[PDB]
Amino acid sequence: MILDTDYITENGKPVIRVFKKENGEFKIEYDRTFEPYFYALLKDDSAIEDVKKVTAKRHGTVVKVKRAEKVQKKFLGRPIEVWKLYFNHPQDVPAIRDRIRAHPAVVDIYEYDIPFAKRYLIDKGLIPMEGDEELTMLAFAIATLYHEGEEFGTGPILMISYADGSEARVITWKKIDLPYVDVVSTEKEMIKRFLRVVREKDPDVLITYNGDNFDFAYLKKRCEELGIKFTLGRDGSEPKIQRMGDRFAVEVKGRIHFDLYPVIRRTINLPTYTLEAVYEAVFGKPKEKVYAEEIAQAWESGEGLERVARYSMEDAKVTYELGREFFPMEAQLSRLIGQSLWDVSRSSTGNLVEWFLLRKAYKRNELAPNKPDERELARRRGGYAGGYVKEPERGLWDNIVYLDFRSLYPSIIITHNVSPDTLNREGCKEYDVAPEVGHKFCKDFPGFIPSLLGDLLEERQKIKRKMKATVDPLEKKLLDYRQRLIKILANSFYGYYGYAKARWYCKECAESVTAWGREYIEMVIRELEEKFGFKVLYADTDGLHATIPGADAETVKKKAKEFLKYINPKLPGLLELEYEGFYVRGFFVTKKKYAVIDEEGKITTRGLEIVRRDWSEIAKETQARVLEAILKHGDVEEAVRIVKEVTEKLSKYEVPPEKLVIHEQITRDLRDYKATGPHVAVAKRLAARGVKIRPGTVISYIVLKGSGRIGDRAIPADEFDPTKHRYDAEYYIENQVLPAVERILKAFGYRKEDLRY
DNA sequence: GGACTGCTTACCC
DNA sequence: ACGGGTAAGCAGTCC
Ligand SMILES: NCCOCCOCCOCCC(=O)O
Ligand SMILES: [Ca+2]
Ligand SMILES: [Ca+2]
Ligand SMILES: [Ca+2]
Ligand SMILES: [Ca+2]
C-alpha cells in the first residue's frame, strides 16, 4: 500500500519518493523519470518558440521552459489542442506562471497549481491505501503547565503520554510511583525518551487529538527552547507545520499523522468536542478531565500527581482507541478520492470532490478548468433557487408516512445529463430543458460528471452485493465504509456545481438540478393529494409527511404503498419515490421543526431546540420532556407540570450550573463582526486576557443575574463559580425554558404566563 | 417605548 | 472551507 508521495532535491534534480508498505516492511521507492508540466492556449503555433524564450528567476537561479509539446486534449468535452511546457524542478512551475500567462499572444494557462507529489499520484494512476497490510499506530498526548494566557510554549511539558496495541505509558520528570509512568530526570530527558520510544516502536501512523494545532506545535516551541532535534520522521526529519487555510496541519514525513479532531468534528455532532466528550459519545464509557489549575497545583505541590498521570495515560489510551476506530474508514476515503489519508483527513468535501475530478479528468484526457481568481469569485456571487419547503399543517397528527425520492439530486444529474460539458451545446439530436431556469442539456453523450456519478452509484450497489456475500465481518465493515462514503461523494456533486470556488462550477447546472427537484416533489404532492385522498402535513426538498385524516394505520400504510406503485412508473429516468417511515403520531411546528414517535416508541426530532447546540441543556431537556408528554403519552397536564417544576427549580436557584451552559461558535476574526452577540462580547473579553479566540472556537458561557444587554452579564462556564455569582433565573426561565416549551405547548392554547413558575 | 430590520448561528435536506 | 431555505434571538434603529 502506497502511504504517500513526496519529492526531495538530490544533486539539483527532483526525486519523487513513493512511501509504501509491502510484505510487513516500509519501503521508499524513488523516481526521477517524472517531470512537472503546465498547459497554455496559444493563438498561433508560431508564437510557441517565441514563448519558449520566457524567463523568470527563483532565488539565485534563472529558470525557463525545459521542454514544450503541442498536446491534443479535450475541454468541457470539445477537443482543444494546447502546449504542455515542462520545467527542471517543480518549484519553477509557480515562478514563471504570471509572466508566461500575461504574454500578449496567449489566452490562458491550465493545470498550473497541482502539487507535484499529488500530480505524480494522479498521472502514474496510483491509489493510496490499496491492499490489506496491517499498519502499526501509536497514539500520543502532552500535558503542559500553561499559565494565564502566556505565550504558546513558554510553559514546559510536564508529561508525554503514548498508547498502542500493547500498552499506555507516561514519560514525566516529577516522581510518580505508578507502573505506567517512567520518570526521566528533566523535561529534555522525557522528550528524548519519547523520541527514542517512537524510533524503537517505528509506527506507520501517529494518532493525535488536535495534534495539527497544539500537541506538535507545542513540542516544537519546547524542542526549540531546549535545543533537542525533534526528529520523528523515518527519513530522520523533524515535523513540517504546513499552513492549511485558517489553521495549520503537521506532517511527519514517512509516518501518517492522523489528527482525529478534524475527522471527529466532520463525522460526529456534539455541543463541545473535548476528547472526554467524544469518548463518552463513540464508546459510551466516561472520562474525568484533570484541568490546568489541577495539573499545575500537582506540579507545584507534588501532592496528587497520580491523578494527572492517570489523565495523561487515559488521554493517550482513548486517542489510540478513537484512532483504531476512525482510521479504517478514513483509509477507504484515501482510496476512493485517491489521495493520502493525511490530505483526505483534513480536506473539505469541496476539495475531496475536486481531487476526484482531476484524477478522472486526467484519465479522461480533459484539461481541468482553473480555480477562480479574486475577480472570478465576485461575478459567481449571485445565488439561485433551492428546494421546495411546504409550510406545515401545524399540530398533532396520527398515522403519518414519510415518502422521499431515493438519491434525488444524483438521479436528476444522471437522468437529465446535467453537466457543464453538456450545457446548451450546438446541434445535439435530443435535449432536456430544465423546468424554470430553462437551460437545455445535451442528451447524445454521457456528460463528464453524470458519467462518473453513474459509475459511483453503479459500484455502490456492487459493494452492497459484495457486502451480503462477505463472511469476514471486518471486510463487511470496510465494505460498508466504501459504500457509505461513495453515497456522500455522489450526494456532494450538486453542491460542488453551486460552489463558486469549485473548478467545475456551473450555476447553470446547480440551478437546473434544484429546479427539477421542485418540479418532481410538487408533482408527487399534487398527485398524492388529488388522485389519492392523502393530506400532506409537511414537505422539504424531496421528502413528504402525509396521512389520510381519520383512517387507521393499516390503511394509511396500504394506500401509501399503493400510491408508490402508481407514481413511480410515471416518474422519469432514475427518479423513484420510496416509503421510508410510518409514525403512530407526529407534531409539525414550523418549517424545519417537527417530531414523530414510531410504532416501537422512538421519538425522532428535527430542528426544534432539543437538537440545537446553541440552546441551554435545561431548555432542551425541558422541551424534550414536554415533547415526550404530548407524543409518547397524551398528558398535556403531565407536560404543563414538567414545565412548572423546571421553572420554580430555576427560580429557586436549585438548577445545576452545568445545565445552564450556552455553546455557540465564533465563525470569523473578532474584529470583522458588525454586531456584538453575548458570545462575541464574551470572546472579545477573553482576547483582552490573551486567550486563543480564533475561528472554530466554541464559546461556553452562563448569563449572570442583572438587567440591560445579555452579553454584559455573559461570563465563561469555566470562570463561573456558585459562591458570590448567582445565575440569571429571569433570562433562563423567560428567554429559554419557557419559549421552547411554549412552541410545543402553544398548539394546546397555553399562555406563557399560564406556565408561570 | 413598541415595532421594524438587520446580524448571526446552527439546522434541515 | 463549501448548496439554498429556514427559525430564531440579540441588539440597535426607527418614528
Ligand atoms: N445534501 C443534499 C441536499 O439534500 C437533498 C436530498 O438528498 C437526499 C438524497 O436521498 C438519499 C436518501 C434516500 O435514498 O432516500
Ligand atoms: Ca423523518
Ligand atoms: Ca433509500
Ligand atoms: Ca457541499
Ligand atoms: Ca451558502
CSV table of C-alpha atoms in Angstrom, one decimal, chain A residues 140-508:
chain,number,residue,atom,x,y,z
A,140,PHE,CA,0.5,10.2,21.9
A,141,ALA,CA,-0.5,13.3,24.0
A,142,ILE,CA,1.1,16.1,26.1
A,143,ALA,CA,0.3,17.8,29.4
A,144,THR,CA,1.6,21.4,29.7
A,145,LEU,CA,1.8,23.9,32.7
A,146,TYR,CA,0.1,26.6,30.6
A,147,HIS,CA,0.0,29.8,32.7
A,148,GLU,CA,-2.8,32.5,32.5
A,149,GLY,CA,-2.9,33.5,28.7
A,150,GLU,CA,1.0,33.4,28.5
A,151,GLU,CA,3.0,32.9,25.2
A,152,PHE,CA,2.3,29.5,23.5
A,153,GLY,CA,5.1,27.1,24.6
A,154,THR,CA,6.5,29.4,27.3
A,155,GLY,CA,5.3,26.7,29.7
A,156,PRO,CA,7.2,23.4,29.9
A,157,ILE,CA,5.6,20.0,29.1
A,158,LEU,CA,5.0,18.0,32.4
A,159,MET,CA,4.1,14.6,30.9
A,160,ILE,CA,4.2,12.9,27.4
A,161,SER,CA,1.5,10.1,27.2
A,162,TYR,CA,1.7,7.3,24.4
A,163,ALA,CA,-0.5,4.3,23.8
A,164,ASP,CA,-0.7,1.4,21.2
A,165,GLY,CA,-1.8,-2.2,20.8
A,166,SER,CA,0.3,-3.4,23.8
A,167,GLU,CA,0.5,-0.6,26.4
A,168,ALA,CA,-0.2,3.0,27.5
A,169,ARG,CA,2.8,4.8,29.3
A,170,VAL,CA,3.5,8.3,30.7
A,171,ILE,CA,7.0,10.0,30.5
A,172,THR,CA,7.4,12.8,33.1
A,173,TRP,CA,10.2,14.5,35.2
A,174,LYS,CA,8.5,14.8,38.6
A,175,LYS,CA,8.4,11.5,40.6
A,176,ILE,CA,5.1,9.4,40.3
A,177,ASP,CA,5.2,5.9,41.8
A,178,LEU,CA,2.9,4.1,39.3
A,179,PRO,CA,3.6,1.1,36.9
A,180,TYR,CA,2.6,3.0,33.7
A,181,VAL,CA,4.8,6.1,34.5
A,182,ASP,CA,8.5,6.4,33.5
A,183,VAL,CA,10.3,9.3,35.4
A,184,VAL,CA,13.1,10.9,33.4
A,185,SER,CA,15.4,13.4,35.3
A,186,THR,CA,14.5,16.5,33.3
A,187,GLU,CA,11.9,17.8,30.6
A,188,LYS,CA,14.6,17.5,27.8
A,189,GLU,CA,15.2,13.9,29.1
A,190,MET,CA,11.5,12.9,28.8
A,191,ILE,CA,11.2,14.3,25.2
A,192,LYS,CA,14.5,12.5,24.2
A,193,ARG,CA,12.9,9.3,25.7
A,194,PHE,CA,9.5,9.9,23.9
A,195,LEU,CA,11.6,10.5,20.7
A,196,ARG,CA,13.5,7.2,21.3
A,197,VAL,CA,10.3,5.3,22.1
A,198,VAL,CA,8.7,6.3,18.7
A,199,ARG,CA,12.0,5.3,16.9
A,200,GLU,CA,12.2,1.9,18.8
A,201,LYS,CA,8.5,1.2,18.0
A,202,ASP,CA,8.7,2.7,14.4
A,203,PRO,CA,4.9,3.2,14.0
A,204,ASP,CA,3.3,3.8,10.5
A,205,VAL,CA,0.5,6.1,12.0
A,206,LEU,CA,0.9,8.7,14.7
A,207,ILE,CA,-2.6,9.4,16.2
A,208,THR,CA,-3.3,12.8,18.0
A,209,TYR,CA,-6.5,14.8,19.1
A,210,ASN,CA,-5.7,18.3,17.7
A,211,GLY,CA,-2.0,17.4,17.1
A,212,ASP,CA,-2.2,19.8,14.0
A,213,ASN,CA,-3.0,22.8,16.1
A,214,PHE,CA,-1.5,22.2,19.6
A,215,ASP,CA,0.5,19.0,20.6
A,216,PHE,CA,3.1,19.0,17.7
A,217,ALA,CA,3.3,22.9,17.6
A,218,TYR,CA,3.9,22.9,21.5
A,219,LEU,CA,6.6,20.1,21.3
A,220,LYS,CA,8.4,22.4,18.7
A,221,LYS,CA,8.5,25.6,20.8
A,222,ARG,CA,9.8,23.3,23.6
A,223,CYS,CA,12.4,21.4,21.4
A,224,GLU,CA,13.3,24.9,20.1
A,225,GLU,CA,13.7,26.4,23.7
A,226,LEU,CA,15.6,23.3,24.9
A,227,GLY,CA,17.8,22.6,21.8
A,228,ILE,CA,16.5,19.0,21.1
A,229,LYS,CA,16.4,17.8,17.4
A,230,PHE,CA,12.7,16.9,17.2
A,231,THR,CA,13.4,14.0,14.8
A,232,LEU,CA,10.2,11.8,14.5
A,233,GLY,CA,10.2,11.1,10.7
A,234,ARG,CA,11.5,7.8,9.2
A,235,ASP,CA,13.9,9.9,7.0
A,236,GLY,CA,15.2,11.3,10.3
A,237,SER,CA,13.5,14.7,9.6
A,238,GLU,CA,11.5,16.9,12.1
A,239,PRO,CA,7.8,17.6,11.5
A,240,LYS,CA,6.7,20.3,8.9
A,241,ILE,CA,4.0,22.6,10.3
A,242,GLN,CA,2.2,23.2,6.8
A,243,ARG,CA,-0.5,26.0,7.0
A,244,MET,CA,-3.9,24.9,5.6
A,245,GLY,CA,-6.3,27.9,5.4
A,246,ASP,CA,-7.5,29.3,8.8
A,247,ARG,CA,-5.5,26.8,10.9
A,248,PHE,CA,-2.2,24.7,10.3
A,249,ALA,CA,-1.6,21.0,9.9
A,250,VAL,CA,1.6,18.9,10.8
A,251,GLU,CA,3.2,16.3,8.5
A,252,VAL,CA,5.7,13.6,9.8
A,253,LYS,CA,7.4,12.5,6.5
A,254,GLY,CA,7.4,8.7,6.5
A,255,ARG,CA,4.5,8.3,9.0
A,256,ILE,CA,0.7,9.0,8.7
A,257,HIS,CA,0.0,11.8,11.3
A,258,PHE,CA,-3.7,11.0,11.9
A,259,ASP,CA,-5.2,14.1,13.7
A,260,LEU,CA,-8.7,12.7,14.7
A,261,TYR,CA,-10.1,16.1,15.7
A,262,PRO,CA,-11.0,17.4,12.2
A,263,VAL,CA,-12.4,13.8,11.3
A,264,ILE,CA,-14.4,13.6,14.7
A,265,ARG,CA,-15.6,17.3,14.1
A,266,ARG,CA,-16.7,16.4,10.5
A,267,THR,CA,-18.3,13.0,11.4
A,268,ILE,CA,-20.0,13.2,14.9
A,269,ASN,CA,-22.3,16.1,16.0
A,270,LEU,CA,-21.7,17.3,19.7
A,271,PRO,CA,-22.1,20.6,21.6
A,272,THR,CA,-18.4,20.5,22.6
A,273,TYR,CA,-15.5,18.4,21.1
A,274,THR,CA,-13.5,17.7,24.3
A,275,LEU,CA,-11.7,14.3,24.0
A,276,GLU,CA,-13.6,13.5,27.2
A,277,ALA,CA,-16.9,14.2,25.3
A,278,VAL,CA,-16.1,12.2,22.1
A,279,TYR,CA,-15.1,9.0,24.2
A,280,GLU,CA,-18.5,9.2,26.0
A,281,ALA,CA,-20.0,9.6,22.5
A,282,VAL,CA,-18.2,6.9,20.5
A,283,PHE,CA,-17.7,4.3,23.3
A,284,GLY,CA,-20.4,5.3,26.0
A,285,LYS,CA,-17.7,4.9,28.7
A,286,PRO,CA,-16.8,8.0,30.8
A,287,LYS,CA,-13.6,10.1,31.2
A,288,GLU,CA,-12.5,12.5,34.0
A,289,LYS,CA,-10.8,15.8,32.8
A,290,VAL,CA,-8.0,16.9,35.1
A,291,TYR,CA,-7.9,20.7,34.4
A,292,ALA,CA,-4.9,23.1,34.1
A,293,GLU,CA,-5.4,24.7,37.6
A,294,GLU,CA,-5.4,21.0,38.9
A,295,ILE,CA,-2.2,19.9,36.9
A,296,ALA,CA,-0.1,23.0,38.0
A,297,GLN,CA,-1.1,22.7,41.7
A,298,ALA,CA,0.0,19.0,41.4
A,299,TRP,CA,3.3,20.0,39.8
A,300,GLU,CA,3.8,22.9,42.3
A,301,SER,CA,2.6,20.8,45.2
A,302,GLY,CA,4.0,17.3,44.3
A,303,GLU,CA,0.7,16.3,46.0
A,304,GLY,CA,-1.7,14.1,43.9
A,305,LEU,CA,0.2,13.9,40.5
A,306,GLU,CA,-1.0,10.3,40.2
A,307,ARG,CA,-4.4,11.7,39.0
A,308,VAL,CA,-2.6,13.8,36.4
A,309,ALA,CA,-0.6,10.7,35.4
A,310,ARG,CA,-3.9,8.7,35.0
A,311,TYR,CA,-5.3,11.6,32.9
A,312,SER,CA,-2.2,11.6,30.6
A,313,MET,CA,-2.3,7.8,30.3
A,314,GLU,CA,-6.1,7.8,29.7
A,315,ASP,CA,-5.8,10.7,27.1
A,316,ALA,CA,-3.3,8.5,25.0
A,317,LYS,CA,-5.3,5.2,25.6
A,318,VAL,CA,-8.5,6.9,24.3
A,319,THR,CA,-6.7,8.7,21.4
A,320,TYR,CA,-5.4,5.2,20.2
A,321,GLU,CA,-8.9,3.6,20.7
A,322,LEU,CA,-10.5,6.5,18.7
A,323,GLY,CA,-7.7,6.2,16.0
A,324,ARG,CA,-8.1,2.4,15.6
A,325,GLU,CA,-11.9,3.1,15.2
A,326,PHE,CA,-11.7,6.0,12.7
A,327,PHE,CA,-8.5,5.3,10.6
A,328,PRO,CA,-10.3,2.3,8.8
A,329,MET,CA,-12.9,4.5,7.1
A,330,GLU,CA,-10.5,7.4,6.7
A,331,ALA,CA,-8.4,4.9,4.7
A,332,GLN,CA,-11.3,3.7,2.4
A,333,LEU,CA,-11.6,7.5,1.7
A,334,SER,CA,-7.9,7.8,0.9
A,335,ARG,CA,-8.6,5.1,-1.8
A,336,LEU,CA,-11.9,6.5,-3.1
A,337,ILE,CA,-10.6,10.1,-3.6
A,338,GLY,CA,-7.2,8.6,-4.5
A,339,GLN,CA,-5.1,11.0,-2.3
A,340,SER,CA,-3.2,10.3,1.1
A,341,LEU,CA,-5.1,9.6,4.3
A,342,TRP,CA,-3.4,12.7,5.6
A,343,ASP,CA,-4.8,15.1,3.0
A,344,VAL,CA,-8.3,13.4,3.0
A,345,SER,CA,-8.5,13.5,6.9
A,346,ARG,CA,-8.2,17.4,6.8
A,347,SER,CA,-9.9,18.3,3.5
A,348,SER,CA,-13.3,19.8,2.8
A,349,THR,CA,-15.7,17.7,0.6
A,350,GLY,CA,-15.2,20.6,-1.9
A,351,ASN,CA,-11.5,19.6,-2.2
A,352,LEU,CA,-12.1,15.8,-1.9
A,353,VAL,CA,-14.6,16.3,-4.9
A,354,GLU,CA,-12.1,18.4,-7.0
A,355,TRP,CA,-9.3,15.8,-6.3
A,356,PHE,CA,-11.6,13.0,-7.6
A,357,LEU,CA,-12.5,15.0,-10.8
A,358,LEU,CA,-8.8,16.0,-11.6
A,359,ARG,CA,-8.0,12.2,-11.3
A,360,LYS,CA,-10.9,11.2,-13.6
A,361,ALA,CA,-10.3,14.2,-15.9
A,362,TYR,CA,-6.6,13.2,-16.5
A,363,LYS,CA,-7.7,9.6,-17.1
A,364,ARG,CA,-10.3,11.2,-19.5
A,365,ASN,CA,-7.8,13.5,-21.4
A,366,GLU,CA,-9.8,16.5,-20.0
A,367,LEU,CA,-7.9,19.8,-19.4
A,368,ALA,CA,-9.2,20.7,-15.9
A,369,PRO,CA,-10.6,24.2,-15.8
A,370,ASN,CA,-8.8,26.6,-13.4
A,371,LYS,CA,-9.8,27.7,-9.8
A,372,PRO,CA,-11.5,31.2,-10.0
A,373,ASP,CA,-9.2,34.2,-9.2
A,374,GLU,CA,-10.3,37.0,-6.8
A,375,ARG,CA,-12.3,38.8,-9.6
A,376,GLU,CA,-13.8,35.4,-10.8
A,377,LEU,CA,-15.4,34.8,-7.4
A,378,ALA,CA,-17.1,38.3,-7.4
A,379,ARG,CA,-19.2,37.5,-10.6
A,380,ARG,CA,-20.0,34.0,-9.1
A,381,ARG,CA,-21.5,35.8,-6.0
A,382,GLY,CA,-25.1,35.5,-7.5
A,383,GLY,CA,-27.2,32.8,-5.7
A,384,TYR,CA,-30.0,30.5,-7.2
A,385,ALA,CA,-33.4,28.9,-6.2
A,386,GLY,CA,-33.1,25.9,-3.8
A,387,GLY,CA,-35.6,23.2,-2.7
A,388,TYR,CA,-39.4,23.4,-2.2
A,389,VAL,CA,-40.2,23.6,1.6
A,390,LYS,CA,-44.0,23.4,2.2
A,391,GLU,CA,-45.5,25.4,5.2
A,392,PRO,CA,-46.6,22.5,7.5
A,393,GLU,CA,-50.2,21.7,8.6
A,394,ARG,CA,-49.4,22.7,12.2
A,395,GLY,CA,-50.4,20.5,15.2
A,396,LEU,CA,-50.7,16.8,16.3
A,397,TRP,CA,-51.5,14.2,13.5
A,398,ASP,CA,-51.9,10.4,13.7
A,399,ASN,CA,-50.8,7.6,11.2
A,400,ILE,CA,-48.1,9.6,9.2
A,401,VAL,CA,-45.9,8.2,6.5
A,402,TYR,CA,-42.5,9.7,5.3
A,403,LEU,CA,-42.1,9.3,1.5
A,404,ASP,CA,-38.9,10.5,-0.2
A,405,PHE,CA,-37.0,10.2,-3.5
A,406,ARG,CA,-34.1,7.8,-3.4
A,407,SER,CA,-30.9,9.9,-4.2
A,408,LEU,CA,-32.9,12.8,-5.8
A,409,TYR,CA,-30.2,15.3,-6.9
A,410,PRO,CA,-27.9,12.4,-8.3
A,411,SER,CA,-30.9,10.8,-10.0
A,412,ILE,CA,-31.6,14.2,-11.8
A,413,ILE,CA,-27.8,14.7,-12.7
A,414,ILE,CA,-27.7,11.1,-14.1
A,415,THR,CA,-31.2,11.3,-15.7
A,416,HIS,CA,-31.1,14.7,-17.4
A,417,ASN,CA,-27.3,14.5,-18.1
A,418,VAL,CA,-26.7,17.8,-16.1
A,419,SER,CA,-23.0,18.7,-16.7
A,420,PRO,CA,-21.1,21.9,-17.7
A,421,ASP,CA,-19.8,19.9,-20.8
A,422,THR,CA,-23.5,19.1,-21.9
A,423,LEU,CA,-24.9,22.6,-21.1
A,424,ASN,CA,-26.5,24.4,-24.1
A,425,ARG,CA,-24.4,22.6,-26.8
A,426,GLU,CA,-24.6,23.2,-30.6
A,427,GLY,CA,-26.8,20.6,-32.6
A,428,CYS,CA,-27.4,17.6,-30.4
A,429,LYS,CA,-30.3,15.4,-31.7
A,430,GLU,CA,-32.2,15.2,-28.3
A,431,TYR,CA,-32.1,17.8,-25.5
A,432,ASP,CA,-33.6,18.2,-21.9
A,433,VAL,CA,-34.8,21.7,-20.9
A,434,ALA,CA,-34.9,22.4,-17.1
A,435,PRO,CA,-38.4,23.4,-15.8
A,436,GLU,CA,-37.9,27.2,-14.8
A,437,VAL,CA,-34.2,28.1,-15.3
A,438,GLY,CA,-34.8,26.9,-19.0
A,439,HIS,CA,-31.2,25.6,-19.6
A,440,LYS,CA,-31.1,22.8,-22.3
A,441,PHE,CA,-28.8,19.8,-21.5
A,442,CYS,CA,-27.4,17.7,-24.5
A,443,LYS,CA,-28.6,14.0,-24.3
A,444,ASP,CA,-26.3,12.5,-27.0
A,445,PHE,CA,-23.1,11.6,-25.0
A,446,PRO,CA,-22.7,10.8,-21.2
A,447,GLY,CA,-21.5,14.1,-19.7
A,448,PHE,CA,-18.3,14.1,-17.7
A,449,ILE,CA,-20.0,14.2,-14.2
A,450,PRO,CA,-23.1,12.2,-15.0
A,451,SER,CA,-20.7,9.6,-16.4
A,452,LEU,CA,-18.6,9.3,-13.2
A,453,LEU,CA,-21.8,9.8,-11.0
A,454,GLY,CA,-23.3,6.7,-12.7
A,455,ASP,CA,-20.1,4.7,-12.2
A,456,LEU,CA,-20.2,5.7,-8.5
A,457,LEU,CA,-23.8,4.5,-7.9
A,458,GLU,CA,-23.1,1.6,-10.3
A,459,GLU,CA,-20.3,0.5,-7.9
A,460,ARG,CA,-22.1,1.4,-4.6
A,461,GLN,CA,-24.7,-1.3,-5.5
A,462,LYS,CA,-21.8,-3.7,-6.4
A,463,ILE,CA,-20.2,-3.0,-2.9
A,464,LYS,CA,-23.7,-3.7,-1.2
A,465,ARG,CA,-23.9,-7.0,-3.1
A,466,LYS,CA,-20.3,-8.0,-2.1
A,467,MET,CA,-21.4,-7.0,1.5
A,468,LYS,CA,-24.3,-9.6,1.6
A,469,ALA,CA,-21.7,-12.2,0.4
A,470,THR,CA,-18.8,-11.2,2.8
A,471,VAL,CA,-18.2,-13.9,5.5
A,472,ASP,CA,-15.3,-11.9,7.3
A,473,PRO,CA,-17.1,-9.3,9.4
A,474,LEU,CA,-14.1,-6.9,9.2
A,475,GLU,CA,-14.4,-6.8,5.4
A,476,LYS,CA,-18.2,-6.3,5.8
A,477,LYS,CA,-17.3,-3.1,7.9
A,478,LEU,CA,-14.5,-2.0,5.5
A,479,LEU,CA,-17.0,-2.7,2.6
A,480,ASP,CA,-19.9,-0.7,4.3
A,481,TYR,CA,-17.4,2.3,4.7
A,482,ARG,CA,-16.7,2.2,0.9
A,483,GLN,CA,-20.5,2.2,0.0
A,484,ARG,CA,-21.5,4.8,2.7
A,485,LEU,CA,-18.7,7.2,1.6
A,486,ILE,CA,-19.5,6.8,-2.2
A,487,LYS,CA,-23.1,7.8,-1.3
A,488,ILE,CA,-21.8,11.0,0.4
A,489,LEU,CA,-19.3,11.8,-2.5
A,490,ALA,CA,-22.2,11.2,-5.0
A,491,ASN,CA,-24.6,13.4,-2.9
A,492,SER,CA,-21.8,16.2,-2.8
A,493,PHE,CA,-21.8,16.7,-6.6
A,494,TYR,CA,-24.9,19.1,-6.8
A,495,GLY,CA,-23.2,21.2,-4.1
A,496,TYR,CA,-19.9,21.3,-5.9
A,497,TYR,CA,-21.8,22.7,-9.0
A,498,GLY,CA,-23.2,25.6,-6.9
A,499,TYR,CA,-19.7,26.2,-5.2
A,500,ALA,CA,-18.1,29.4,-6.5
A,501,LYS,CA,-14.5,28.1,-5.5
A,502,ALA,CA,-15.2,24.8,-7.5
A,503,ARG,CA,-13.1,24.2,-10.6
A,504,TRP,CA,-16.2,22.7,-12.4
A,505,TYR,CA,-18.6,25.5,-11.0
A,506,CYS,CA,-21.8,25.6,-13.1
A,507,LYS,CA,-24.6,27.9,-11.7
A,508,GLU,CA,-26.5,26.7,-14.8
